[model samples]
Target: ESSWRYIDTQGQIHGPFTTQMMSQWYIGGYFASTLQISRLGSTPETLGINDIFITLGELMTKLEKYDTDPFTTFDKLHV
Candidate 1:
């Protein structure tokens, strides 16, 4: 049998959730969280799908670059 668990920042123990329930809950929460973040900006132009896609693409590029040189200094991190 598989289980999922994590400790919260407050040190509270949470979950021995079944894999299926955990996955569904996680994905649902993820989309819901993104929706909340999207709504925080004033105008559609500021938080529309195209803007999200461009931001995500740029983030992915940085992530890939970091993965390619995991041991090197992330100069941006120093700033």
Candidate 2:
């Protein structure tokens, strides 16, 4: 019953992983955690709907929260 996934700094899909792993990676800066996506039978779909994750601008906010990264280099988010 694991419906979590993530992508990295590159345009690579890194999940279909786990909820536990997902949250951990988020605080660790490993999970992009954000606001957008398109997966059927998605989380909300667990309620019998469909939905997903994050946004590009918001993504930069997180990825660039510090270190002056601006996240202009990182890809989008994954929450």
Candidate 3:
């Protein structure tokens, strides 16, 4: 699987998140849809949550029910 990074509203960068984990955070409203994403495993243009999540209907649907109660912060990658 590919590792990914995201740019927060404050312009801070955070990641190594799997696609699924990011989906959970998105559903939890930890960040906005305009958030930027940079995939580490590939060389490509940067992406926004709005641009990325739209094509991930099945992925998002699977993660939609997953709880985000355990999430702490993206910066430290852990609580």
Top candidate on lDDT is 3
TM-score of 3: 0.46
What order do you get sorting by TM-score, best first? 3, 2, 1
Give Cα-based local distance difference scores for all models: 0.40, 0.47, 0.57
What are the root-mean-square deviations of the candidates from the true structure over C-alphas?
A: 14.4, 11.7, 11.6
- The per-candidate count of clashes, in order, stands at 0, 10, 0
Ranking by lDDT: 3, 2, 1
User: What TM-scores do the predictions have?
Assistant: 0.32, 0.40, 0.46
Worst 10 residues of 1 by lDDT: 31-40
- Tell me the tens digit of each residue's lDDT in model 3 across 1-79: 5667876668777777986897688788786545566556454443323324232344344455544554633433753
**Model 2 C-alpha RMSD to native:** 11.7
lDDT of 1 by residue, 1-79 (tens): 3344433446554555555664577567632222211112223432233212223234344446545553455654563
Better of 2 and 3 by TM-score: 3
Model 3: lDDT of residue 37? 69
